[PDB]
Amino acid sequence: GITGTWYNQLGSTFIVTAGADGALTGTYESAVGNAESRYVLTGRYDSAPATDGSGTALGWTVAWKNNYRNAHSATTWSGQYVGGAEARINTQWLLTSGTTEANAWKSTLVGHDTFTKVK
Amino acid sequence: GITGTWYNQLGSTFIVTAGADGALTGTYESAVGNAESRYVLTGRYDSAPATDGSGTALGWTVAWKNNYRNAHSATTWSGQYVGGAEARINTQWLLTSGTTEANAWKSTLVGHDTFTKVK
Amino acid sequence: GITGTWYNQLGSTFIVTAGADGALTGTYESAVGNAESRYVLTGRYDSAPATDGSGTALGWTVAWKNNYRNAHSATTWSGQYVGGAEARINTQWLLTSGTTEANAWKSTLVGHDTFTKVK
Amino acid sequence: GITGTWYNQLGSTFIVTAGADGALTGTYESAVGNAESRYVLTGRYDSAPATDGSGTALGWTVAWKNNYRNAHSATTWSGQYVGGAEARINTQWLLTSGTTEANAWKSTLVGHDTFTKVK
């Protein structure tokens, strides 16, 4: 149930296709990256998770560049997919901007985003 | 100069191919994931960085599963490639394990890894 | 309104006294640290925040040791106090365990905790 | 050997006094906070670490306000003190700025700092 369309708490949409090889492909919109544009995502997930009741660990990367905009930054999400009655993806993320060496200390943002299948 | 073979401070090797579309593909070995096995990585990087002297922001994901082992975890690196005389990739990373809901608070590790082209 | 008794999403209680010098003192209970024991906290907050409508940035540290237990770890919370009708403290946290040098890569946990004044 | 004067990789000085109660008090200078000013720190450390050879887990908070400046931000460091021939404090840190609710996603920076006793 990991393949589908997901929404976070802020309004981003996360359309993803999980493959049997463990690949993870799709698109991302709708800020923290930028206001109104689609961005390519790619990532991985473990395709045979534990059956003791557990999250399916996954992660994906969006580089914030398309034909319209370039923010010179990349966000990687790292979390686990929690199956059940309401499907849930709880992630931590890191957003790194391309900086000079004197500005390398303030290059990385950190936050968290939870994803649901309903909005 | 982002395509090539990289080594971190602990002994991991990071063989990567950057594509013109912004894609990022390769393999990863040699602990924090697991001891001696190859793992598929995928990620993204911005393919037209700023020319004011700046890092090329990038990120990639490894799910720690191959034909030999499965740790039920995924690591995402987020950093910038710093070009120059000695090439350098300075990253922060998040390692998320698949846990139960009662253990969801301790599911995510955080650290940092710097990558050089010589070892 | 930062002085008082706070509760997170998991059941921890956070009794804190803010001082006019910017000091921050109190006690902490009730897991991620350990099950049922009180722990000394200390931290700081900016005592003259911006009046444009903004969070009051704060942070505090708990070392998980009292007369009963010692987990050999410390958690630091970093967040902002958001005033209003419902008072709110939204934090990110880092929990570092004392490890050997070979285990230094997995020494730091990361998560997030939001605190309210009602439970 | 945790009491003393420490220096990071960027030039910050970290003068600290550890107490027998587990308290941690001192001053901080010299950027990531701000250019040239002293700031009060407070924090905690476990006062009876493991004797199997291990770091002493510690953490401290600096709110970036004194009589001269106010950045409306706070940094918390979380790490372990590694004793030996060369004393070492390896930390991760979180820097949270006071933001509006619409800017709450980009409020927290993350990085790392290693501290030595010689500069």
Numbering used by the authors:
A (entry chain D), B (entry chain B), C (entry chain C), D (entry chain A): 16 to 134
Show me the paper's own sentences about this structure.
In the cryo-EM reconstruction of streptavidin, fine details were obtained after a routine 2D classification process (inset). From the dataset we were able to obtain a 3D reconstruction of streptavidin at a resolution of 2.2 Å. All of the side chains of the amino acid residues were clearly assigned. For phenylalanine or tryptophan, the benzene at their side chains appeared as a ring-like density with an obvious hole in the center. Even for alanine, which has a minimal side chain, its methylene group was unambiguously visualized on the EM map.
Here we found that the uniformity of thin ice relies on the surface flatness of the supporting film, and developed a method to use ultraflat graphene (UFG) as the support for cryo-EM specimen preparation to achieve better control of vitreous ice thickness.
